[PDB]
């Protein structure tokens, strides 16, 4: 799994370009827009 059948070494694994910031700069605005609609819905639930 690290070596091939012939004992050779597997190639270098692929990584996506500049990726940790690409997965980190999506969660935060989608964590604020999961927080804003909480109050937007709850303050109408506490009226109707």
């Amino acid at each position: 799994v690290i070596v091939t059948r012939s004992g050779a070494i597997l190639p270098k694994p692929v990584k996506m370009s500049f990726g940790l910031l690409r997965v980190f700069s999506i969660v935060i605005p989608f964590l604020y827009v999961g927080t804003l609609i909480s109050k937007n819905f709850a303050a109408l639930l506490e009226e109707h």
Binding site: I26, V27, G34, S38, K39, A42
Partner: protein, 250 residues
């Protein structure tokens, strides 16, 4: 007596007259003969007044023939007076001159096949390219539409956290939203079972995206009129030619 070689060895078992003992013997088909069979028989017991093995034609078979040469046919086993019948479980020059004729017509035939296979491997790669130019763009559209499903499922994962996070720290305390947060988990279990029963495939991450990729590719293959039945025929017929040209080398 009986012959069974389910063990790999034909189990024969014989009793002499007036004995109580039903002795069983192990005899090979390849390195055992009649001789040491009778010697293993007659070192055991005392009723060796007579011993013989006749043919079913009555004539004695010689005591140095093979066991697989013996039990392929029947035989009358004869000890001192009693008779045991056994029921055991029951162009070569033309092929040589064919091999010797096809030995001469390889060095010309492989050369007669190699250039033809190079010709077809060139014509199919000429065929492939105006399909490949369309297929790369359709595959790029399917790639983008699959990537927008992956990062969009991440959005639902990151939005459910916020909607469960604002209530249970500002407005609605945990003791009257804990039943909601249990049943979202149980509804997430029922959906993972329904995806199994509805698609006949286990819900794992690297297979579900390569399920949605083929849906987002075969929706776009017809809507841009990509004749896929041509493409998976050319891609088969190139690699099948290449596996043959690999075999012509060694």
């Amino acid at each position: 007596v009986t012959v069974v070689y389910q063990n790999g060895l034909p189990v024969i078992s014989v009793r002499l007259p007036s004995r109580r003992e039903r002795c069983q013997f192990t005899l090979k088909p390849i390195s055992d003969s009649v001789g040491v069979f009778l010697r293993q028989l007659q070192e055991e017991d005392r009723g060796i007044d007579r011993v013989a093995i006749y043919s079913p034609d009555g004539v004695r078979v010689a005591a140095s023939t093979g066991i697989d040469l013996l039990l392929l046919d029947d035989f009358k086993l004869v000890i001192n007076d009693l008779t045991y019948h056994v029921r055991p479980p029951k162009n070569d020059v033309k092929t040589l001159v064919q091999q010797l004729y096809t030995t001469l017509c390889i060095e010309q035939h492989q050369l007669n096949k190699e250039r033809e296979l190079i010709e077809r491997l060139e014509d199919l790669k000429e065929q492939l390219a105006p399909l490949e130019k369309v297929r790369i763009e359709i595959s790029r559209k399917a790639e983008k539409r699959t990537t927008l499903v992956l990062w969009g499922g991440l959005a639902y994962m990151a939005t459910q956290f916020g909607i469960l996070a604002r209530l249970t720290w500002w407005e609605y305390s945990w003791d009257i939203m804990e039943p909601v947060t249990y049943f979202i988990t149980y509804g997430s279990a029922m959906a993972m079972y329904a995806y199994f029963v509805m698609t006949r495939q286990e819900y794992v991450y690297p297979e579900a995206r390569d399920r949605q990729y083929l849906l987002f590719f075969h929706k776009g293959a017809k809507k841009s009129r990509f004749d896929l039945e041509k493409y998976n025929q050319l891609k088969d017929a190139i690699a099948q030619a290449e596996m043959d040209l690999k075999r012509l080398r060694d």
